[PDB]
Design a protein around this nucleic acid. Structure first.
Length: 189
DNA sequence: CCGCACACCCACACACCAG
DNA sequence: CCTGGTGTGTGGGTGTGCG
């Protein structure tokens, strides 16, 4: 065991500000351990999380390519607005928006009738698919808070698990689906 | 005779492939 | 990228034990 010096703490803080989107990873801290060998990713993360976070105060803004924003002379831009992290959580709204989209899909499939009006394209369920061609690709485009892969897995692992109708009755009856799924996150010496 | 340093946990968002 | 099987490591912590 080794104590964290003020110098090291300020180094950890600086690194997180220049890599804000990685603030909640483990890998960021494992990399930091390369420069401050007396410590490990685990101790650095914990040190940051529990002790140093109250001192972050600001991070530097990054662009859409994950890179830092630099000006004419190469200076950075401070911000109290954290950028999006690596993973985005699903919201109840999102779950409902997905379930409904799938329900409408199955409705059109089975009845060849428009769910909104009743126009001829010429309820409940307990079927998995098949899922229409490019359904998730287009769902992602229209709702880009998650990628096509994220939406698809959310449908497979959570929606199909909880049940489309069940979730729709639940949401409307008023939140997100949950807990329907070497040990990772252990970057030791 | 306890606070810090460090280990470890785990559901799961997001990913990729083969058949 | 149709489905299923399955990998990766984040995100948010908790468990442990040294000095």
């Amino acid at each position: 065991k080794a104590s964290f010096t003020d110098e090291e703490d300020e180094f950890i803080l600086d690194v997180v500000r220049k890599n804000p989107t990685r603030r909640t990873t483990h890998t960021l801290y494992d990399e930091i351990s390369h420069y401050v060998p007396n410590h490990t990713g685990n101790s650095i993360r914990h040190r940051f999380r529990v002790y140093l976070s109250k001192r972050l105060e600001y991070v530097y803004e990054v662009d859409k390519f994950g890179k830092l924003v630099r000006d004419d002379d190469g200076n950075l831009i401070k911000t109290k607005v954290l950028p999006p992290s690596i993973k985005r959580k699903f919201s109840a709204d999102e779950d409902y928006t997905l379930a409904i989209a799938v329900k409408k899909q199955f409705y059109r499939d089975l009845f060849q009738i428009d769910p909104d009006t009743g126009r001829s394209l010429i309820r409940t369920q307990s079927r998995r698919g098949p899922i229409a061609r490019e359904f998730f690709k287009h769902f992602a485009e229209e709702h880009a808070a998650h990628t096509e892969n994220a939406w698809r897995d959310r449908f497979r692992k959570f929606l199909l698990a909880y049940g489309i109708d069940d979730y729709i009755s639940y949401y409307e009856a008023e939140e997100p689906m949950k807990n329907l799924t070497p040990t990772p996150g252990n970057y030791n010496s």
